[PDB]
Amino acid sequence: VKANYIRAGRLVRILRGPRQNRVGVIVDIVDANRVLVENPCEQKMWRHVQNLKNVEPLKFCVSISRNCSTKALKEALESKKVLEKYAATKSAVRIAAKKAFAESTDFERYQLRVAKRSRAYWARKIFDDNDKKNPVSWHKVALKKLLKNAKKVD
């Protein structure tokens, strides 16, 4: 219903192959569950066959014809600057972040741990002094109930 359509010129990302998490544009369709994928602005990713269970369509499309030249595809990609827009997408940044964590050297892992702890401390300080005025937490709400209850007896 809301799926992106498989067609010539549609960008895809590979799921589980040797070229995992790589992007290329579909150039042709052969039968129901096979296409030809190519990306001329990136190492590897020459024209090759890919099963349709191993790709996911993206939102970006490029105007080309079926069985187009490699130089024609390269020209089309740079004119629309589609590759840059995908890099700015939140899905691409999440994938890039996970690769950066896998390469970490136990000193950058410590640096990330320090950075997260600093944010958590300051969030705690910000949450308080907004609980003193306009109380929202469980304890600060119950403090108003306790004080009013004790007003009559005391």
Give contact residues for RNA (rule: CB under 7 A): 1-5, 7, 10, 15-18, 32-33, 46, 50-51, 53-54, 59-61, 65-68, 113-114, 116-124, 137-138, 141, 144-145, 148-150, 152-154
- In angstroms, give the least distance from the CB of 71 to RNA: 9
- In angstroms, give the least distance from the CB of 72 to another protein: 26
Distance CA 130, CA 125 (A): 9
- Amino acid (one-letter) located at 57: P
| SS (HEC) of 85-114 | HHHHCHHHHHHHHHHHHHCCCCCHHHHHHH
What are the structure tokens assigned to 46, written together?
């020459």
Task: Pick what 21 binds: RNA, another protein, none; C-beta below 5 to 8 Å, kind-dependent.
Answer: none
SS3 of 119, please? Answer: helix
What are the structure tokens assigned to 43, written together?
């190492």
- Amino acid (one-letter) located at 141: V
Which listed range, 9-17, 20-28, 60-68, 141-149, lies at the site for another protein (CB under 8 A)?
Answer: 141-149
Which residues 91-130 are close enough to bind another protein by CB under 8 A?
93-94, 96-97, 100-101, 111-112, 114-116, 118-119, 122-128, 130
Q: 100-108 contacts: CB < 8 A, separation 24 or more?
A: none
What are the structure tokens assigned to 23, written together?
């992007």
Chain residues that interact with another protein, rule: CB under 8 A? 1, 32, 93-94, 96-97, 100-101, 111-112, 114-116, 118-119, 122-128, 130, 136-137, 139-140, 142-143, 146-147, 149-150
